[PDB]
């Protein structure tokens, strides 16, 4: 009943668009040590996506301003220091999520579905760290992202159907990682195309409860392919 | 930008 | 920090949609004691509008949930305690703004334009307090809002042109106050209609620097009239 | 509906 109250409070915070409150509720649920249900897993994922998402969006705006103010030394230095402040928040949020994944989520995942979901999530949060990392630190971070995505990729190919939304969502983010982080448009296109074509060949495997999610991800995979081959 | 998001 | 530096940081925070940072910068500027420029005044106004705005929006969502929970006592209690937590934040923000207006902004306003601006702002933040107040203290809060708006209304009619965005914006919010706080649809309609008709009769007084703001407010005044007379 | 920034 206590865990159920924290989950109800998280759902209230979601509706009120108070994502710091939502993330704090779901972090406390996770820290209780019990394996999360599909609903709890999704509430934790939505909460942190919005929390980290606000920083990634702010980072992109401030970086664009920093580039556009070349020539104006005072304006550019200010944009640089504000970008550094946003990066610190971003790193603190990513480290919070990655710590939850290492200590509770990945070790307790008893199903292929949840294990793939958390390893993809580990891949995503190291990728967000990689977007604002530099030097030696970056090489290690990028490596960690690739290793998490690779293990999730192998499990999904072995245990899930090609139309499974989690398998598809992983192929979408792993292809984004190759394009944006590793600067490999051909590997990114090959991954995305294979995932799309294998799902298209087995549309009979779609379920009524998840066909919308599956078809939406397939559309996103093909949108990326169109963009990357233009 | 087109990721899952997640 | 330096005044011009704090203002530049506030403009960066605005673009990054980091309104807590924006408000903290502008609060520090105000506390330096010097009269704010038109730009500084607007940055302070935008910052706090967004800070308080997020709480007003969350309050409406949570109150609606609490009301639709009529029948489930424990679940209703959770939404009620969450609404109260949001109200506390909302009151703290309003009290912050109202304190800045009384101590620095209203006493140092050296022009009719800035005096009207700050008194309208005082009217607005007491109106936001009135939206979440009950019974006995509500009456005093409602009176403070009406008095601020009334003094701003008299100065604007005497010193500003009917198309002035500040005069129009004040008529828009004062009419909202009559409709939503005093439950007087006819006085709200009369105030809004007079403001719209007087601006329509003098469209030759529009300036290139502020015709966009003036015409947008005129559209909002007429939208309210249409809604309140339907 | 009040003032728009
Ligand atoms: O449609 C309006 O409300 C309006 C407002 C300003 C000027 C001309 C207009 O038609």
Q: 3-state SS string over chain A?
A: CHHHHHHHHHHHHHHCCCHHHHHHHHHHHHCCCCCCCHHHHHHHHHHHHHHHHHHHHHHHHHHHHHHHCCCCHHHHHHHHHHHHHHHHHHHHHHHHHHHHHHHHHHHHCCCHHHHHHHHHHHHHHHHHHHCCCCHHHHHHHHHHHHHHHHHHHHHHHHHCCCCCHHHHHHHHHHHHHHHHHCCCHHHHHHHHHHHHHHHHHCHHHCCCCCHHHHHHHHHHHHHHHHHHCC
| Interface probe, candidates C9, C18, C62, chain A, greatest A C-beta count within 10 A | C18
Distance C216 CA to ligand 1 centre (A): 8
In the 3-class helix/strand/coil scheme, how is chain C assigned residue by residue?
A: CCHHHHHHHHHHHHHCCCHHHHHHHHHHHHCCCCCCCHHHHHHHHHHHHHHHHHHHHHHHHHHHHHHCCCCCHHHHHHHHHHHHHHHHHHHHHHHHHHHHHHHHHHHHCCCHHHHHHHHHHHHHHHHHHHHCCCHHHHHHHHHHHHHHHHHHHHHHHHHCCCCCHHHHHHHHHHHHHHHHHCCCHHHHHHHHHHHHHHHHHCHHHCCCCCHHHHHHHHHHHHHHHHHHCC
User: For C65, phi and psi rounded to 5 degrees?
Assistant: -60, -45
Q: Match 């706090």 to its residue by tokens.
A: C48
| Contact (CB, 8 A) for C85 and C50 | no
CB atoms within 10 A of CB C52: 22
| Contact residues for A34 (Cβ-Cβ < 8 A; gap 6+) | A3, A108
Regarding chains B and C, contact by 3 or more CB pairs under 8 A is answered as no
Rounded to whole angstroms, how far apart are CA atoms A50 and C125? Answer: 29
Contact C8 A75 (CB under 8 A): yes
- For residue B3, give the DSSP letter: -
C69 and chain A: CB distance < 8 Å anywhere? no
Rounded to whole angstroms, how far apart are CA atoms C161 and C56? Answer: 32
How many domains is chain C built from?
1
Rounded to whole angstroms, how far apart are CA atoms C109 and C99? Answer: 15
CATH of the domain at C54: 1.20.190.20
Q: In the numeric block, which tokens belong to residue C47?
A: 């910052």
User: How far from the centroid of its chain's Cα atoms is residue A201's Cα?
Assistant: 27
Q: Buried b vs exposed e over A3-18: b needs ≥16 C-beta within 10 Å?
A: eeebbebbebbbebeb
Q: Match 């995305």 to its residue by tokens.
A: A192
| Contact (CB, 8 A) for A32 and A7 | no
Rounded to whole angstroms, how far apart are CA atoms C122 and C117? Answer: 9
| Contact (CB, 8 A) for A11 and C61 | no
Q: How far apart are the two ends of chain B, measured CA to CA in Å?
A: 13
Rounded to whole angstroms, how far apart are CA atoms C171 and C158? Answer: 14
C222 in contact with ligand 1, CB cutoff 6 A: yes
Rounded to whole angstroms, how far apart are CA atoms A148 and C128? Answer: 48
User: Closest residue (by CA) to atom 6 of ligand 1?
Assistant: C215
Instruction: Please choose, from the candidates C173, C137, C133, the residue with its C-alpha nearest in 3D space to the C-alpha of residue C152.
Output: C173
| Contact residues for C222 (Cβ-Cβ < 8 A; gap 6+) | C192, C196
| Contact residues for C24 (Cβ-Cβ < 8 A; gap 6+) | none
Q: In the numeric block, which tokens belong to residue C142?
A: 């409602």
| Contact (CB, 8 A) for C191 and C152 | no
Q: Buried b vs exposed e over C140-173: b needs ≥16 C-beta within 10 Å?
A: ebbebbbebbebbbebbeeebebbbbbbbbbbbb
User: How far from the centroid of its chain's Cα atoms is residue A128's Cα?
Assistant: 8
This structure's resolution (Å) is 2.0
Cα distances from C30 to residues A10, C17, C47, C100, in angstroms, run 37, 21, 13, 7
User: For C208, phi and psi rounded to 5 degrees?
Assistant: -65, -30
| Contact (CB, 8 A) for A176 and A192 | no
Q: Interior CA angle at A106 toward A132 and A33, to 5°?
A: 115
| Contact (CB, 8 A) for C197 and C203 | no
C56 in contact with ligand 1, CB cutoff 6 A: no
**Structure solved using which method?**
X-ray
Q: Cα-Cα-Cα-Cα dihedral of A206, A209, A212, A215, to 10°?
A: -20
Task: Count the alpha carbons within 13 Å of C104 in the hemisphere toward its beta carbon.
Answer: 17
Rounded to whole angstroms, how far apart are CA atoms C139 and C131? Answer: 11
| Contact (CB, 8 A) for A123 and A152 | yes
Residue C34: domain span = 3-229
Angle between helices A73-100 and A112-130 (to 10 degrees): 160
Rounded to whole angstroms, how far apart are CA atoms C165 and A71? Answer: 36
Q: Is B2 helix (H, G, I), strand (E, B) or coil?
A: coil
| Contact residues for C157 (Cβ-Cβ < 8 A; gap 6+) | C167
Rounded to whole angstroms, how far apart are CA atoms A114 and A109? Answer: 6
Contact C78 A16 (CB under 8 A): no
Chain D environment of C169 (Cβ under 8 Å): 3
Rounded to whole angstroms, how far apart are CA atoms A149 and A167? Answer: 11
Rounded to whole angstroms, how far apart are CA atoms C122 and D1? Answer: 18
């Amino acid at each position: 009943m206590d865990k159920n109250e924290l989950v109800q409070k998280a759902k209230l915070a979601e509706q009120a668009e108070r994502y710091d409150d939502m993330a704090a509720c779901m972090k406390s649920v996770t820290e209780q040590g019990a394996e999360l249900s599909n609903e709890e897993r999704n509430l934790l994922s939505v909460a942190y996506k919005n929390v980290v998402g606000a920083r990634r969006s702010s980072w992109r705006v401030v970086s664009s301003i920093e580039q556009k103010t070349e020539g104006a030394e005072k304006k550019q230095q200010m944009a640089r220091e504000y970008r550094e402040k946003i990066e610190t928040e971003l790193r603190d949020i990513c480290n919070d999520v990655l710590s939850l994944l290492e200590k509770f989520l990945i070790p307790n995942a008893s199903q292929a579905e949840s294990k793939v979901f958390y390893l993809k999530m580990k891949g995503d949060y190291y990728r967000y760290l990689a977007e604002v990392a530099a030097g030696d630190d970056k090489k290690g971070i990028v490596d960690q992202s690739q290793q998490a995505y690779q293990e999730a990729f192998e499990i999904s190919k072995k245990e899930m159907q090609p139309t499974h939304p989690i398998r598809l969502g992983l192929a979408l983010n792993f292809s984004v990682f190759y394009y944006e982080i590793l600067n490999s448009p051909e590997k990114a296109c090959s991954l995305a195309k294979t995932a799309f074509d294998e799902a298209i060949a087995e549309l009979d495997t779609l379920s009524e409860e998840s066909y919308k999610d599956s078809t939406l991800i397939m559309q996103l995979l093909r949108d990326n392919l169109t963009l990357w081959t233009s | 930008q087109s990721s899952a998001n997640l």
